[PDB]
Amino acid sequence: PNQALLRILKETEFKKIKVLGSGAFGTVYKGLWIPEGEKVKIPVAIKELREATSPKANKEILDEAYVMASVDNPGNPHVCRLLGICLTSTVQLITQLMPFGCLLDYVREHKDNIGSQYLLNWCVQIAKGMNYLEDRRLVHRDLAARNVLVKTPQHVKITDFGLAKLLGVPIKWMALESILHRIYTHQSDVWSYGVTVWELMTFGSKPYDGIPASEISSILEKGERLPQPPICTIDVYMIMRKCWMIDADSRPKFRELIIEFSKMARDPQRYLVIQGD
Numbered sequence: 109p110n111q112a113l114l115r116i117l118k119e120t121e122f123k124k125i126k127v128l129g130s131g132a133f134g135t136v137y138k139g140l141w142i143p144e145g146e147k148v149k150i151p152v153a154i155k156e157l158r159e160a161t162s163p164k165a166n167k168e169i170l171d172e173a174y175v176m177a178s179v180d181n182p183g184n185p186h187v188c189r190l191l192g193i194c195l196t197s198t199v200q201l202i203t204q205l206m207p208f209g210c211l212l213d214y215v216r217e218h219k220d221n222i223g224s225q226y227l228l229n230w231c232v233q234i235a236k237g238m239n240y241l242e243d244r245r246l247v248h249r250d251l252a253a254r255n256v257l258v259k260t261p262q263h264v265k266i267t268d269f270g271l272a273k274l275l276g277v278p279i280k281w282m283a284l285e286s287i288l289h290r291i292y293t294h295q296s297d298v299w300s301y302g303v304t305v306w307e308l309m310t311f312g313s314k315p316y317d318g319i320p321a322s323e324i325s326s327i328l329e330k331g332e333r334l335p336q337p338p339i340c341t342i343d344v345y346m347i348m349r350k351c352w353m354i355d356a357d358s359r360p361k362f363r364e365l366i367i368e369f370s371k372m373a374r375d376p377q378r379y380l381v382i383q384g385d
């Protein structure tokens with residue numbers, strides 16, 4: 109039967125070669141993972157969390173990783189898999205290196221060359237990965253375009269899921285029930301998915317630009333939402349609006365979003381209007 113792949117790594121066994129970026133949970137480095145007793149040198153990304161932690165707190169992280177990072181059994185092509193973890197005065201997470209970066213930077217850098225087929229396919233892929241997370245009862249809590257990574261321009265993967273349940277704030281991506289009462293469910297992830305789609309359709313525009321984070325809940329209560337992106341027909345915008353209903357049970361399911369976006373992906377020029385398709 110299918111085994112649980114996550115590995116506990118020694119401080120040796122992997123090396124950090126260059127800083128890649130970040131300033132949110134920690135610092136990401138590109139490096140090599142040399143599994144002891146083997147002859148492979150695997151290129152990996154290493155996230156070293158900024159908080160300190162203790163040997164007792166590290167055991168709680170280990171207990172959470174055993175419940176969490178293990179019950180992602182078959183794997184999904186659109187979900188990043190945690191290859192290893194090393195807890196020793198710092199918390200370090202090891203995944204396969206993705207040289208092409210995040211989808212947020214990609215859509216900003218290629219604004220003038222992105223077609224409707226690519227945009228709709230990324231929506232399909234993100235929903236497939238999120239549906240897989242829902243099947244394994246894992247709430248992401250931080251779905252955003254910065255947390256979607258580019259394997260190839262035709263293949264994206266979700267990363268950084270459950271990085272809050274591991275031990276113990278993106279207001280403009282959060283559902284109203286998350287802002288007000290810190291309630292997080294697969295349906296609050298659907299809201300964040302809708303904001304992520306908006307990010308892609310606006311080529312990486314900042315949601316609610318120039319509006320303070322303290323004002324978002326009162327704007328959502330008033331009924332205001334993110335505007336219809338220029339390339340979006342009413343069809344795609346309606347899906348986004350459904351993701352942002354106050355009633356979490358009235359929002360789409362990731363399983364329904366796979367079907368809607370896959371239908372739109374079959375005839376993309378009908379749903380997105382881009383100068384150059």
Ligand SMILES: *CCC(=O)N1C[C@@H](n2cc(-c3ccncc3)c(-c3cccc(OCc4ccc5c(c4)CN(C)C5=O)c3)n2)C[C@H]1C
Binds near residue numbers: 254271274
């Ligand atoms: C462009 C956006 C940006 O600046 N960032 C995105 C974010 N980031 C990027 C990477 C990464 C870069 C290159 N190659 C791969 C990944 C990561 C990242 C690095 C190392 C580990 C890591 O783990 C995420 C994760 C995966 C799976 C699980 C968890 C966490 C928790 N559980 C339970 C899992 O199963 C991600 N991060 C920051 C910056 C660089």
